[PDB]
Amino acid sequence: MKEFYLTVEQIGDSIFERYIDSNGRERTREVEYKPSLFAHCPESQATKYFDIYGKPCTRKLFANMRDASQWIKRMEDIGLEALGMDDFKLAYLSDTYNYEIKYDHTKIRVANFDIEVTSPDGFPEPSQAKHPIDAITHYDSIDDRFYVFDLLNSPYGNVEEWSIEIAAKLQEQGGDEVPSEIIDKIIYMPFDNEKELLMEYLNFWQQKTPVILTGWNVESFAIPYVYNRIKNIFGESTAKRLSPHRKTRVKVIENMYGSREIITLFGISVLDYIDLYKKFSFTNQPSYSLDYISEFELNVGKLKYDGPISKLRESNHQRYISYNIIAVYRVLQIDAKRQFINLSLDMGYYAKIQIQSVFSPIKTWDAIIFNSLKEQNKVIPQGRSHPVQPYPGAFVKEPIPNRYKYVMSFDLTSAYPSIIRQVNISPETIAGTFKVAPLHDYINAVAERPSDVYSCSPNGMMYYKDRDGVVPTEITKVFNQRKEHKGYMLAAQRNGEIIKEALHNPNLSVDEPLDVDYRFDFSDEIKEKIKKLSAKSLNEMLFRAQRTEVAGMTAQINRKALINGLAGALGNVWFRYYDLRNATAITTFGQMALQWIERKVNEYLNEVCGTEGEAFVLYGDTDSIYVSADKIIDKVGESKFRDTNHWVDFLDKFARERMEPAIDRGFREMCEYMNNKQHLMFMDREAIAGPPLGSKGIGGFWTGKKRYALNVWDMEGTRYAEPKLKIMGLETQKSSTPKAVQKALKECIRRMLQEGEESLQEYFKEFEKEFRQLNYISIASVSSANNIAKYDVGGFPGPKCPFHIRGILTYNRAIKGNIDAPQVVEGEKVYVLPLREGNPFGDKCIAWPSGTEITDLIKDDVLHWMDYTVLLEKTFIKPLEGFTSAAKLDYEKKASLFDMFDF
DNA sequence: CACGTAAGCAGTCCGCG
DNA sequence: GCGGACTGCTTAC
Ligand SMILES: Nc1ccn([C@H]2C[C@H](O)[C@@H](COP(=O)(O)OP(=O)(O)OP(=O)(O)O)O2)c(=O)n1
Ligand SMILES: [Ca+2]
Ligand SMILES: [Ca+2]
Ligand SMILES: [Ca+2]
Ligand SMILES: [Ca+2]
Ligand SMILES: [Ca+2]
């Protein structure tokens, strides 16, 4: 095979690299890397090296890496640019792998692990590691085995061996329900003392050295705990065995409110699954415990246990070890679905970066652009300092708060990257400037054409038409990948609905799911076979299609995030190619495009409907428009439609065959106006929205910018079996809104949009009646708890103290001294409940760590003192009041003259 | 060692015969 | 009691 790297590190004048060789074996080597950097030379100097602006440079080959670094310092001291890749492991990889890396993931060792530590005196801090590690489960992707290290003897209790036979039994039978499909894959290793356990773990770790190290909170808990515990028992140098190169750094991550002390293990690439999840999943969760996420992603039940975790090993060691195993499997299960490890490897190798660098769009693009430019013997510019400067972004139209019966939405495909590609925006394609006119003057086609020679943005910038930028070139490659996957996701989504339709009339048969590729639209032949299938076979088909869709989702949306990150990076002061002229070229163009095409659509629709000056476009944000279709419908007459699908068909056909061509014409004119390199403003239909035909449903409503709901029947060519709510910004979408309230608000909305005012009233009445019976957790608010210390004045609230912080302080007072109670962690999330006046907590609210039951010693009083009235008014009524007033209806029957009569 | 801006809502402080 | 200026959190793009 072709060789590829696993890990790369810089250690003094040495590059340390783990790799896979041509025989597909894992290898290491230490390389005395001889780096080059560049300096501008005179034109008379004959060279093959040019900077991005075509100015010649001379190569400086250094005897080592320290020499290269000190030369940089001397160049600074002189006042002259030091060009080339200053991060040497990137140059190294670029030099070593000068070809498209093709990797084999079966050769990459991926470790998934989690440890247990019994702690009678509060949370067991990694930096002290004062308590014994009494369990470790470590899954090795190459062996496909869970290696389990079990401490039988501890200061905190001596226990019997764990039983795999009991582990595998149903919970209802006293066992642990360890999933059967991993039972044969567990290798259980009991130990009479911690030292032999750790010693064994280390030797095992040396035999099977992780390349990708993952797990849940491994970076903040398991890794530093293991390292520090080994350090305290054996010494630092024994702890350093956790690094293939015997090197580690007790690091400092600089977040906005504090700093977490992590351990960098050199020669390992740590991707904590909690971090992958937060970056790649596009959820905002009220809690990030594994229990919570596992239930969310997989629909599995909470691993329940009697008592506290600090007493679980002693009371039920059997269950303790099973849970440690299951927890490790659960990450594998989430990854099997989401495929974030595959994503990271995909992106990491594509970029030629350390795998953990996928967290940084800036590092990723720096590596991509450098590799692209190096191929052409070009020399990247030095990184420079810039002060932080605000700049303008998108345009958002002020909507008229109202109900909106029929709506059709459109937006730009990959808007900012397409603008980059259309205009030819790159650091080295800048041609000059022109004198700007007010934006509205371009929007209305009254301003002078900017240039008949160069490609332009309405921000005043001009670009070359006759040559490609490295930014456009490289952003196009990723965009094209993005497009392939989204095709795969949308087909799987369309296939899913075909399956949901066939589920209305399932056959009574015993059959099997069809072997198909869910990534391509089902053929007529497959559609026919599906109409004959049982419920069981259809339901397994539907599961597979939806997993195929999630996989496409993961792949497309994160490549979209990456290319969008390139547009944003141009406005980040740490980006080698930082430039507010380029950043602003993009956003100002976006504003023009949205408002241009608003005009064109209003003009067009007036024209076809035979009218003048009527406002069709009701709203738009950044690259989208929302078109009221009431008049399109009225023009033909609602009466003429057979059912709901008949008008959805009509509007779909109208958008595709009439509106899109006119939009296309609209944007080609703007392209000529700006004299751009290439027309790439593709504004395709998104949603067709309206009430069920013959219903009292209102179809949709807007409350303000970024706040709206639509009853959608078709989304980007997916014709739903059942209408789906598109809700943006409203409380149902906010992780701070109580779970049960999100759900209740959503049904209120569904009723408004699909059924009408009277249906809404019926539901409101019921929820209001029954809501005091809801589980306290389902009705608690959620908030991040940042800067708790600042507002802590002797255990009490300082000035300007935020409500949720106040609740943490109340919590901290009620649990004072009791070491069993879980502490609130800085920057993590809390559940929040308001308290009736005169409560024994002595304040108006309480807050505890989210995803958890509040500790048993205060639970009782919380449940008794909760302020239901305040909670209903704040989380439910006030937002519902906003929806309904916007929509011009009432959630409660208003008083009237009819009130004088008898029922 | 570091993708972007726009913009809505909850809450605190504070004025107000 | 409710505006208005302000911090803090959060979501649409
Ligand atoms: N997380 C996000 C989402 C949006 N935007 C900017 C860049 C996008 O190009 C633009 C439009 O937002 P979209 O959500 O419509 O994203 P795209 O237009 O890029 O992709 P799609 O083809 O899915 O519409 O907003 C951004 O910078 N970061
Ligand atoms: Ca645990
Ligand atoms: Ca878009
Ligand atoms: Ca059937
Ligand atoms: Ca959009
Ligand atoms: Ca689209």
PDB file of N, CA, C and O in Angstrom, chain A residues 705-727:
ATOM      1  N   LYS A 705     -37.414  39.286  13.615  1.00  0.00           N
ATOM      2  CA  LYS A 705     -36.240  38.709  13.004  1.00  0.00           C
ATOM      3  C   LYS A 705     -35.896  37.381  13.726  1.00  0.00           C
ATOM      4  O   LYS A 705     -36.037  37.258  14.961  1.00  0.00           O
ATOM      5  N   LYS A 706     -35.508  36.379  12.940  1.00  0.00           N
ATOM      6  CA  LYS A 706     -34.984  35.120  13.465  1.00  0.00           C
ATOM      7  C   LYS A 706     -35.981  34.353  14.354  1.00  0.00           C
ATOM      8  O   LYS A 706     -35.574  33.497  15.128  1.00  0.00           O
ATOM      9  N   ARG A 707     -37.282  34.624  14.200  1.00  0.00           N
ATOM     10  CA  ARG A 707     -38.323  34.021  15.050  1.00  0.00           C
ATOM     11  C   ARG A 707     -39.636  33.680  14.296  1.00  0.00           C
ATOM     12  O   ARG A 707     -40.456  34.564  14.028  1.00  0.00           O
ATOM     13  N   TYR A 708     -39.850  32.399  13.994  1.00  0.00           N
ATOM     14  CA  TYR A 708     -40.929  32.015  13.094  1.00  0.00           C
ATOM     15  C   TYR A 708     -41.218  30.526  13.094  1.00  0.00           C
ATOM     16  O   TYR A 708     -40.435  29.742  13.608  1.00  0.00           O
ATOM     17  N   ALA A 709     -42.365  30.151  12.528  1.00  0.00           N
ATOM     18  CA  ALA A 709     -42.789  28.774  12.463  1.00  0.00           C
ATOM     19  C   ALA A 709     -43.552  28.583  11.175  1.00  0.00           C
ATOM     20  O   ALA A 709     -44.311  29.452  10.774  1.00  0.00           O
ATOM     21  N   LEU A 710     -43.348  27.445  10.530  1.00  0.00           N
ATOM     22  CA  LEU A 710     -44.055  27.128   9.300  1.00  0.00           C
ATOM     23  C   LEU A 710     -44.440  25.671   9.334  1.00  0.00           C
ATOM     24  O   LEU A 710     -43.655  24.815   9.766  1.00  0.00           O
ATOM     25  N   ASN A 711     -45.629  25.389   8.840  1.00  0.00           N
ATOM     26  CA  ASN A 711     -46.060  24.028   8.627  1.00  0.00           C
ATOM     27  C   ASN A 711     -45.561  23.555   7.257  1.00  0.00           C
ATOM     28  O   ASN A 711     -46.117  23.928   6.227  1.00  0.00           O
ATOM     29  N   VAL A 712     -44.511  22.745   7.236  1.00  0.00           N
ATOM     30  CA  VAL A 712     -43.880  22.412   5.946  1.00  0.00           C
ATOM     31  C   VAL A 712     -44.341  21.066   5.374  1.00  0.00           C
ATOM     32  O   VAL A 712     -44.464  20.088   6.117  1.00  0.00           O
ATOM     33  N   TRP A 713     -44.627  21.055   4.062  1.00  0.00           N
ATOM     34  CA  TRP A 713     -45.025  19.845   3.313  1.00  0.00           C
ATOM     35  C   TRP A 713     -43.915  19.267   2.420  1.00  0.00           C
ATOM     36  O   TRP A 713     -43.901  18.070   2.126  1.00  0.00           O
ATOM     37  N   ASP A 714     -42.977  20.099   2.007  1.00  0.00           N
ATOM     38  CA  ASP A 714     -41.888  19.659   1.149  1.00  0.00           C
ATOM     39  C   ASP A 714     -40.679  20.518   1.501  1.00  0.00           C
ATOM     40  O   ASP A 714     -40.786  21.746   1.576  1.00  0.00           O
ATOM     41  N   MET A 715     -39.543  19.867   1.737  1.00  0.00           N
ATOM     42  CA  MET A 715     -38.293  20.535   2.089  1.00  0.00           C
ATOM     43  C   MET A 715     -37.189  20.026   1.161  1.00  0.00           C
ATOM     44  O   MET A 715     -36.808  18.857   1.256  1.00  0.00           O
ATOM     45  N   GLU A 716     -36.714  20.906   0.268  1.00  0.00           N
ATOM     46  CA  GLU A 716     -35.669  20.630  -0.720  1.00  0.00           C
ATOM     47  C   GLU A 716     -35.937  19.357  -1.514  1.00  0.00           C
ATOM     48  O   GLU A 716     -35.028  18.544  -1.696  1.00  0.00           O
ATOM     49  N   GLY A 717     -37.183  19.165  -1.945  1.00  0.00           N
ATOM     50  CA  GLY A 717     -37.554  18.005  -2.753  1.00  0.00           C
ATOM     51  C   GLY A 717     -37.885  16.760  -1.936  1.00  0.00           C
ATOM     52  O   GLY A 717     -38.072  15.675  -2.486  1.00  0.00           O
ATOM     53  N   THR A 718     -37.967  16.901  -0.619  1.00  0.00           N
ATOM     54  CA  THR A 718     -38.461  15.802   0.193  1.00  0.00           C
ATOM     55  C   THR A 718     -39.943  16.064   0.431  1.00  0.00           C
ATOM     56  O   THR A 718     -40.313  17.012   1.116  1.00  0.00           O
ATOM     57  N   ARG A 719     -40.800  15.264  -0.177  1.00  0.00           N
ATOM     58  CA  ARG A 719     -42.242  15.365   0.077  1.00  0.00           C
ATOM     59  C   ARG A 719     -42.600  14.567   1.325  1.00  0.00           C
ATOM     60  O   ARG A 719     -42.573  13.339   1.307  1.00  0.00           O
ATOM     61  N   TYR A 720     -42.922  15.238   2.423  1.00  0.00           N
ATOM     62  CA  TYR A 720     -43.171  14.486   3.652  1.00  0.00           C
ATOM     63  C   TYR A 720     -44.441  13.661   3.574  1.00  0.00           C
ATOM     64  O   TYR A 720     -45.411  14.066   2.949  1.00  0.00           O
ATOM     65  N   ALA A 721     -44.414  12.504   4.230  1.00  0.00           N
ATOM     66  CA  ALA A 721     -45.619  11.714   4.487  1.00  0.00           C
ATOM     67  C   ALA A 721     -46.516  12.472   5.466  1.00  0.00           C
ATOM     68  O   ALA A 721     -47.733  12.427   5.363  1.00  0.00           O
ATOM     69  N   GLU A 722     -45.903  13.180   6.404  1.00  0.00           N
ATOM     70  CA  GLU A 722     -46.645  13.990   7.365  1.00  0.00           C
ATOM     71  C   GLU A 722     -46.030  15.369   7.450  1.00  0.00           C
ATOM     72  O   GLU A 722     -44.801  15.487   7.499  1.00  0.00           O
ATOM     73  N   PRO A 723     -46.869  16.419   7.508  1.00  0.00           N
ATOM     74  CA  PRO A 723     -46.292  17.770   7.590  1.00  0.00           C
ATOM     75  C   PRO A 723     -45.308  17.887   8.771  1.00  0.00           C
ATOM     76  O   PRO A 723     -45.514  17.266   9.811  1.00  0.00           O
ATOM     77  N   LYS A 724     -44.235  18.648   8.588  1.00  0.00           N
ATOM     78  CA  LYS A 724     -43.221  18.837   9.627  1.00  0.00           C
ATOM     79  C   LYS A 724     -43.080  20.318   9.984  1.00  0.00           C
ATOM     80  O   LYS A 724     -43.039  21.169   9.115  1.00  0.00           O
ATOM     81  N   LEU A 725     -42.994  20.626  11.267  1.00  0.00           N
ATOM     82  CA  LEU A 725     -42.855  22.007  11.675  1.00  0.00           C
ATOM     83  C   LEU A 725     -41.434  22.520  11.429  1.00  0.00           C
ATOM     84  O   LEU A 725     -40.468  21.915  11.888  1.00  0.00           O
ATOM     85  N   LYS A 726     -41.290  23.596  10.661  1.00  0.00           N
ATOM     86  CA  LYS A 726     -39.989  24.259  10.639  1.00  0.00           C
ATOM     87  C   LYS A 726     -40.112  25.407  11.609  1.00  0.00           C
ATOM     88  O   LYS A 726     -40.820  26.387  11.313  1.00  0.00           O
ATOM     89  N   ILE A 727     -39.459  25.284  12.768  1.00  0.00           N
ATOM     90  CA  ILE A 727     -39.501  26.358  13.788  1.00  0.00           C
ATOM     91  C   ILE A 727     -38.114  26.865  14.045  1.00  0.00           C
ATOM     92  O   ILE A 727     -37.231  26.092  14.381  1.00  0.00           O
TER      93      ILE A 727
END
